[PDB]
């Protein structure tokens, strides 16, 4: 019930919480809405759903860039490094975000505009063979009971990763991540003083996200062959 003072980290923690909430609405504070598109059986790809999904995906990528620019120090890195970090973690952050909007009761996920799709629709919107993997991840994430602070910190840790290849100032990146790592650990103990194992458990989730995002890249190639036009440009650049 007692904790040493950590004003600086507390402050950083507050800034990250706000960056996330402002760049990604909460599941509760939003009006959910559905669609009847190919909601019953699975199809190779439902273009109507894809249209909306790729649009929301483009917008969330933009939100993630905004989130990045709100992280103390991020803009202090070279533009090259900013781009490298964002390209390396964007899909991971996108997957984490949608999974935190999973509703197990109805087996659905809710996008930032309220669109709520069931598993079959998520599959038909473009998730394809990655659908069950993603739902499994979301189901296993719920028990961690992460809030916006923990989610934002995890996204920030994933993004500010000095291990990414081709960084101009990897060390400078490592320097930025440490406070975030420290802040997440302390904040976790704040909420759960009994679960001293929640920190490593949450950190592990990042590696879990990677296994899915690594496959997402392959899904891009397949999607390119299924859709009539070009892959939305921003999605192209991020997975490029």
């Amino acid at each position: 019930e007692s904790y040493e003072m950590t004003a600086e980290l507390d402050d950083l923690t507050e800034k990250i919480r706000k960056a996330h909430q402002e760049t990604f609405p909460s599941l509760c504070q939003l009006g959910k809405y559905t669609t009847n598109s190919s909601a019953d059986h699975r199809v190779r790809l439902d273009l109507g759903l894809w249209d909306k999904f790729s649009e929301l995906a483009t917008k969330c990528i933009i939100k993630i860039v905004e989130f990045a620019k709100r992280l103390p120090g991020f803009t202090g890195l070279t533009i090259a490094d900013q781009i490298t970090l964002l390209k390396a973690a964007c899909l991971d952050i996108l997957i984490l975000r949608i999974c935190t909007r999973y509703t197990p009761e109805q087996d659905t996920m809710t996008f930032s505009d309220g669109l709520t799709l069931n598993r079959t629709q998520m599959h038909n919107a473009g998730f394809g063979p990655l659908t069950d993997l993603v739902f499994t991840f979301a189901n296993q994430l719920l028990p961690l009971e992460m809030d916006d602070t923990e989610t934002g910190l995890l996204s920030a840790i994933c993004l500010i990763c000095g291990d990414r290849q081709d960084l101009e100032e990897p060390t400078k990146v490592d320097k930025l991540q440490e406070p975030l790592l420290e802040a997440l650990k302390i904040y976790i103990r704040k909420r759960r003083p009994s679960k001293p194992h929640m920190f490593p458990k949450i950190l592990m989730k990042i590696t879990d996200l990677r296994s899915i995002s690594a496959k997402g890249a392959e899904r891009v190639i397949t999607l390119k062959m299924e859709i009539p036009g070009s892959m939305p440009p921003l999605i192209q650049e991020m997975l490029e």
Binding site: I62, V65, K69, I79, Q82, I83, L86, K87, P233, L234, E237, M238, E240
Partner: peptide, 11 residues
């Protein structure tokens, strides 16, 4: 090249 991301990051 990442004309989109550059642009979004520069401003």
């Amino acid at each position: 090249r990442h004309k989109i991301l550059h642009r979004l990051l520069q401003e």
